[PDB]
Paper text:
Surprisingly, we recently determined that the TD of the tree shrew p53 protein (TS-p53TD) is dramatically more thermostable than HU-p53TD despite the fact that the two TDs share very a high sequence identity percentage. In comparing the TS-p53TD with the HU-p53TD structure, there are two major regions where structural differences are observed, and these differences occur in areas that contain the three amino acid differences in the two sequences within the structured region of these p53TDs. The first difference occurs in the region around L350 and Q354 in the HU-p53TD, which corresponds to L350 and M354 in the TS-p53TD. In the structure of the TS-p53TD, the side chains of L350 and M354 from the adjacent monomers are in proximity to each other and in position to make hydrophobic contacts with the same residues of the other monomer within the dimer. The second key difference between the TS-p53TD and HU-p53TD structures occurs in the hydrophobic core, formed between the four helices, that stabilizes the tetrameric structure. In this region, the aromatic side chain of F341 in the HU-p53TD is substituted by the aliphatic L341 in the TS-p53TD and L344 in the HU-p53TD is substituted by I344 in the TS-p53TD. In addition, the sulfur atom of M340 from one dimer is 0.5 Å closer (4.0 versus 4.5 Å) to the nearest methyl group of I344 of the other dimer in the TS-p53TD than the sulfur atom of M340 is to the nearest methyl group of L344 of the other dimer in the HU-p53TD. Together, these two differences help explain the enhanced thermostability of the TS-p53TD in comparison to the HU-p53TD. In addition, the results demonstrate that M340 in the TS-p53TD oxidizes at a slower rate than the M340 of the HU-p53TD under these conditions, which we postulate is due to the increased stability of the TS-p53TD relative to the HU-p53TD.
The p53 protein is a transcriptional regulatory factor and many of its functions require that it forms a tetrameric structure. The four domains include a central core DNA-binding domain, an N-terminal transcriptional activation domain, a tetramerization domain (TD) located just C-terminal to the DNA-binding domain, and a C-terminal regulatory domain that is controlled through numerous post-translational modifications. To generate the tetrameric form of p53, two monomers form an initial dimeric structure through interactions between their β-strands that results in a two-stranded β-sheet as well as hydrophobic packing between the helices from each monomer. Next, two dimers come together to form the tetramer, which is stabilized by a helical bundle that forms through a series of hydrophobic and electrostatic contacts between the side chains of the amino acids located in the four α-helices from each monomer.
Numbering used by the authors:
A (entry chain A), D (entry chain A): 324 to 356
B (entry chain B), C (entry chain B): 325 to 356
The structure:
């Protein structure tokens, strides 16, 4: 299975941007299986 | 400022998002 | 709405940003 | 040299987010040469 990694992000706005991207990529993951 | 953490699935995805993240940090630093 | 264009240098970078872009579109569509 | 590609982006906020990312990546390009 996938290994998980943690990224340190500077700034709330940047965090929210990268979090939204990550959440979207994970939704794509869910449709693949 | 306290920094945030984001947990990412997959090495390639992590490396991509890390590259983006660090490039954004560089852009801030180069502006001054 | 009129959509925007962004010009990107490099196939790998383009594919990465396109994947992100389309995943965001999917997230919108799945919310309703 | 690099080939350029155009991406169609839906929504101004998303455009600004991806544009900022792209601009940052290109700045990194400039420091490599």
């Amino acid at each position: 299975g996938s290994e998980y990694f943690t990224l340190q992000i500077r700034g709330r706005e940047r965090f929210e941007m990268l979090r939204e991207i990550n959440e979207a990529l994970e939704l794509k993951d869910a449709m693949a299986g």
